[PDB]
Design a protein around this nucleic acid. Structure first.
Lengths: 136, 136, 136
DNA sequence: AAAAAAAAAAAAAAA
């Protein structure tokens, strides 16, 4: 094919350790998956510069519930959830950017490659239940 | 099978230190993989005779982008890109030879043996971002 | 059990010193491995009566490559490679006998016992390049 | 809960 300038790629030097972490959604991209689903690609920034990615895929039974947990995590980091129809729309897209969240980070295999993946957005209850088990 | 001069093999004494470097594509070579994929074998040379190799495999869905990043790295080193169809062809083969590039080199574990392998080709943006964080 | 006459064993008094060497393929004999692959057993005679052995083992992914390098070594000693199918056949078998080659010999250890073994066949440029860095 | 993902490349064998 003919050359077409490709995009700058973000350096993902450092992953999240396994467990629960406070993180901020440092970026939100609108993309389409390889199987042709509309998704929001949440980029996640930790307090020691840990980078992580999360895919909010649309057009299935879980999408609604999935996003409610993202919103609930935002709510419990001290932000009011506005009166808007949440889903595949610009309000939702813009609302997520820059927000404090609680994330879970589990291991995950794919093509025999193990990485630390962001799996879930946690409520206050879930974040503390997990965090109050750790010994300094 | 009928005879086919195998590719000359060099002394891999000095390899690239970890991180990102300016390099040249010293040699390009046609080669069939163990799984039976066509690839170009890019020999990279550094400013103090560090050596490394890069496997540009054809067939995969990443081929295009992977080559795009090679080309874009060449673009950002002062060479302009011809209006040719880039791929598994002769023009591509001849173009890549003797071109200044930006590369990343990470640690790569394979069957016990860790070694410093060229992983990516970097754009100007990518390159300056990681090179500007070094001190004196 | 019942006595069968055993075969004469060739006197392997002196072995190659480590490094690169001009040598002749003095003998070639096809055998079965302990694991049970067909293979050629190249005997190699040095210019000071050094004796070494090389095992070209058939039935693996790199059989053809290892053979190609042998032929390349013969090619670069003033011999033209004919348009023959190279492999486990009589023609390849008989072509190898008596040819000049360049060999590499390294230390090797099987059952505690150390041995100078023939590990590779070198091209012209490969041979000269090894001889360059010996003078230092 | 369902869906997301850079793919691919590396001697093996002899004794």
């Amino acid at each position: 094919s003919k050359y077409e300038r490709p995009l700058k790629r973000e350096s993902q030097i450092k992953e999240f350790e396994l467990g629960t972490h406070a993180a901020v959604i440092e970026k939100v991209q609108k993309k389409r998956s390889q199987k042709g689903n509309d998704m929001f690609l949440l980029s996640l920034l930790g307090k020691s510069n840990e980078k992580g990615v999360y895919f909010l895929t649309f057009g299935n039974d879980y999408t609604e519930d999935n996003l409610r947990y993202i919103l609930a995590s935002i709510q419990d980091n001290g932000v009011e959830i506005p009166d808007v129809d949440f889903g595949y729309n610009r309000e939702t897209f813009e609302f997520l950017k820059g927000k404090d969240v609680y994330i879970q980070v589990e291991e995950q295999e794919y093509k025999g490659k193990v990485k630390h993946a962001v799996t879930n957005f946690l409520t206050q209850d879930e974040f503390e239940e997990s965090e109050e088990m750790e010994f300094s």
